[PDB]
Predict the 3D structure of the following.
Amino acid sequence: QSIGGVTPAGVYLYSFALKPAGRQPSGTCNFSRIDNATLSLTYKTCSID
Amino acid sequence: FYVPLIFFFNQTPGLALPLIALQYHEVKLYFTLASQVQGVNYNGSSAIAGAAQPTMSVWVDYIFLDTQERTRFAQLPHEYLIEQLQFTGSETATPSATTQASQNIRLNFNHPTKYLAWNFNNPTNYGQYTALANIPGACSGAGTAA
Amino acid sequence: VGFGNKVSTQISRNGDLITDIVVEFVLTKGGNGGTTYYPAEELLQDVEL
Amino acid sequence: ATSPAAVLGNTETVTANTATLLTALNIYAKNYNVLRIMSGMGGLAYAN
Amino acid sequence: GGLSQLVAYGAQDVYLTGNPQITFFKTVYRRYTNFAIESIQQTINGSVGFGNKVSTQISRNGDLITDIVVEFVLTKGGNGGTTYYPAEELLQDVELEIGGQRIDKHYNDWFRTYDALFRMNDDRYNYRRMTDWVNNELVGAQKRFYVPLIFFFNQTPGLALPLIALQYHEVKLYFTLASQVQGVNYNGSSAIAGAAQPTMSVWVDYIFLDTQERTRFAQLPHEYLIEQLQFTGSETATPSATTQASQNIRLNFNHPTKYLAWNFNNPTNYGQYTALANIPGACSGAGTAAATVTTPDYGNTGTYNEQLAVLDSAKIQLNGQDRFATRKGSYFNKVQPYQSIGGVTPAGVYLYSFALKPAGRQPSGTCNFSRIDNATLSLTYKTCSIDATSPAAVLGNTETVTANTATLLTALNIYAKNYNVLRIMSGMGGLAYA
Amino acid sequence: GGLSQLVAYGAQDVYLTGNPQITFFKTVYRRYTNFAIESIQQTINGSVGFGNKVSTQISRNGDLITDIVVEFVLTKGGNGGTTYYPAEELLQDVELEIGGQRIDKHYNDWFRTYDALFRMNDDRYNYRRMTDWVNNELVGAQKRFYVPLIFFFNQTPGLALPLIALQYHEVKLYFTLASQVQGVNYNGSSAIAGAAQPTMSVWVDYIFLDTQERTRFAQLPHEYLIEQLQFTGSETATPSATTQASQNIRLNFNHPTKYLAWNFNNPTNYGQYTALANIPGACSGAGTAAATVTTPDYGNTGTYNEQLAVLDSAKIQLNGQDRFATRKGSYFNKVQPYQSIGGVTPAGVYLYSFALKPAGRQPSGTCNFSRIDNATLSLTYKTCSIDATSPAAVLGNTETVTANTATLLTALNIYAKNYNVLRIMSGMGGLAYA
Amino acid sequence: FYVPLIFFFNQTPGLALPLIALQYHEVKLYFTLASQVQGVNYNGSSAIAGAAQPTMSVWVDYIFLDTQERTRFAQLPHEYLIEQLQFTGSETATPSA
Amino acid sequence: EIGGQRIDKHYNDWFRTYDALFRMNDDRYNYRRMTDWVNNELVGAQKR
Amino acid sequence: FRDTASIGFSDTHQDEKTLRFLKKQISQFIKHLKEYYPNNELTKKLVMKYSDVQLLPYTKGATKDTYTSGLFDHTTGVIKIAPRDGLGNVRDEQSLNKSICHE
């Protein structure tokens, strides 16, 4: 949606910006204005041989 | 799987659809799901016993405007230049092994058109726009006895 | 939701403007590699706006 | 189509015998219109 | 008794009987003009016989004309079961000319399609009695057949054509007789030795007006809202036994149209709108060892058995845009006429109305094809995979398939019925739009 | 979509939708008066039985009356196939009297003729279900029959008879019960031992009006446009195997006649309007060794096979002048009702309308015989040369011939339905014209 | 198969339901499908092995009015005299020999 | 969700924790009767 | 034409600020230890919890259109003087058009 390339497995991106690959600062998120900034991750089970 | 849509407002923020200025109109997406999907519930014409039914979810990315921008949209008329897709299906004059088949297809189209595009296909096999052949990537089993 | 079925959704007014739309599907292979071709694209037979 | 020599060594004006299976033709046209929004309602400026 | 129903009346009846406007127990009939009706024979120019084109000029015997019935005398060239509406088949077409202008034209197939959609119940049966042999008559039987015309002025006194107001213009009917009629002079492709040539007579029912009404018609301008039939015959994308054919048929139609109608047929067998099969009534010899699925049971050519029809689905586009959701052939065969006509339509015959009440005369919604540069009918056909000679296959099959013999249905007839105005003034007349 | 059609507006749509007058999508029903309908049993004076006369006085149990149904309970004197409309046959006649004066009268044969011409489809079947045994009932089977009357007030609320405006006149129905009813107490000429006598009951549907409506009926004068039936029986000139008998019958008729109707019959067998023959539905035992053409298959007495009808052709002459050109019997049997009624008329029954819509109440052209010094019906019969016992001859014959058994159709019934005015005022009434 | 509905607005154009003037209220149809259908999935009381489930679809005929009629419907209050079906089940007194 | 906003959310475990703390006596038992099989029911038993 | 003026998002009265809002209140008010201000002055704290709106207009006039109630759509036998409704089968448009096309 935002870059147009192909990201390899294991790498994740969450943009706030409309065009994160560019220089025009559109749609940013000011984290210093947010008390609790939490990334909540859920993992897959490690069952596959 | 994630299938992005390709409607005019799905390509640029420049055409973000003004739900804010559409207080009387709902915007809907109607979908038809294929009766068969190759390699998922059918192998060619053969149904795959035990194939699972799909799970579907539709996601829409929304823009939250600030007070002044939101208000202006809510209080203003808007004119968005949009794209539309026109489409008709036709029978390909059946190609012949003996001569060069030809065809004249009346194009029942309208509006300022950016471009035309077309393809020929075998309706049996989704995405098949070419003939099959025994060369390495052109048919099932290409390159061998089978 | 199912093969050959019709579904629809109303885009709720969950914001002011909309852009990207992504239809997610979960499919399971009915054969081995080499048997599918853009099957989620094929599954999405059509969409009307 | 089953013989690479014929499939790959052929001329500009010919194709595979299996090309006769390509019986469907899909013609598309992508155009412009104007989606007007006013007084809470949408519509299309150009009917046809 | 009933007085207790009358007495137990309240607030909920205010919308039914409060401040009453009408009653039902006292009818005022309208006093009307003085007139009389007479059926008068016209003289036919040209020789009547098979394959001939003949015509008649309508005599100025009365002041207005309404009903017209064409009489024929036909004989049976074989036994019962060999003919199918032969008088209808015989009258290949009729063209109506007023002032030298074509006003309208009907075809034998139209009469069959029209009947299939718009006549019903005992009207339909009686009509059949007027065009065919329906009491198991045998070879050599002779019968007087009537074929009422279906031009706008032949359906109601309301559109009576004022010949009296056409003092300088003549009105003519041109009739084409079929070169062959099944079970009369030809059995399939084989001529029937000794077959008789038909006789023919055209009868016009005239209205005689009294002095005041007659004077007004003769002197004043008249504008009639009338119907016209548009028709084009074309080739069918005949379905394969291996797949589903499709076809885009551009529609060369014009004027405000009430409805479209169409059928698929076999030109070699009049009225055959379906495939043939070894099931009762569906073919010659059906049900026994001698059954053949190349020759129909002519006396039972028509059927309601949709399995023998070929349309899978269809849609109409206007200027390249979908008019309505794509619908199944059975929608157009069974539901459309339910919704808009109220009768039963035989398999192989389809209707799509743009009008609320297409069977009436009062306009009730139309599609003006003069404003639709690219109207198109888009068809999808059934797969002709079913072995017609085996009932297990013919009767036990799926929605999307039909008989292998359905590939005999190579012709497609598309009709459109529209409005126009027949303007008559100063002794002359013609259409407002032409 | 639908919008693509609405937008497509042209010059030719102006006369359909410009300056609109109505909309189809929003209706306003008329507010009406307050009333109720009740079925009340009338007493029967006289003695109920075969061949007996009975009568009823319509008790003043409401303000206006409409429908009247005569109930009968009959027991089959034989098996299925032995009766034909026996309740219709039993009610030999009914006479309507107001104030001691005959207004109208119907006959069992009229009911059969009327039904043959004017009822149709499932109305006709449901009617048969109320007058006959139609589910193959067996000897001894008992059934309650309902024979509706067809006087002008028995067909429409619009002519409900205002008993409320007739304080000094009674309204009575006199009835004659048939001496014999086929398949009930007699089988052809033979009596059926042990046959039961009928049980009879007469029902009248009364209309209760509210205060304002009933007061107006009681105090105001009324002029009700009503129907009357004129009828005479005649001897049919008898045709033979060597000749086409012809006959000119002076019509002793009066009043503005809506239509004439007639039939030929074998008076022996109720409803037999055609010749008998050895073809599947044309005689007792048809199709087998026991077949006879002297006795009908009573349950299948009627037929649409004109080959068995006697009339060849006919015309009506007024004051020495031909009213219309001579037409074939099939014109009067099939075309007339096609054009004027819309149902199917069985062979042997004929109609000639002077009216555009003879099946309705509103007058639409009439022939006033009170102003015609000499009205005559001219009939030509077919040659009775066909051997009725031989299907080849019965079914393979020509237009101008019929069965040798057609000479048994020696009775002719000529009817005329006309319009008069029933004048009611100051508690009494009668007709405007004699 | 096509099963037409028999609600008051399904019988005449005169009672067409004005969705246009029902802007705030949705119109819904609730459909109950029988547990068993004779000759389709059951024969008398016996289930038919292998019987298919029905495929269902609902089609509605929508009338598009032109601007003046459309506007008039939207701006005015309306009253439609309609019919309703009342229904209750009862036990039949058992008839007897 | 009301008006597109989340007001609240439950989890099966929450229902269990909540019950463990706040329902009691016959309320708790009746609750169990509405969510489990408490009369020694056997395989195949069907309950709402 | 759904008649739903709702935003459909949590923005009407949600007050999506951080915990810093509690400090902003001390900026809106004048304090250093606010644990005693709302226990006494609750009206001002209710005054500092109010939303700012913006209204929206639109207008279309009215469609004064008579000629409705088309129940009997079979046919209608014209009155005796039919040339009062007879010259209405074709209006003045297809009557004036044929005269202008004469040039």
Observations:
- The radius of gyration of chain F is 25 Å.
- The longest strand of chain F covers residues 411-425.
- Helices of chain F lie at 2-6, 14-17, 86-90, 108-118, 121-129, 211-219, 329-340, 391-395.
- The interface with chain I takes residues 11-12, 14-15, 18-24, 26-29 of chain F (CB under 8 Å).
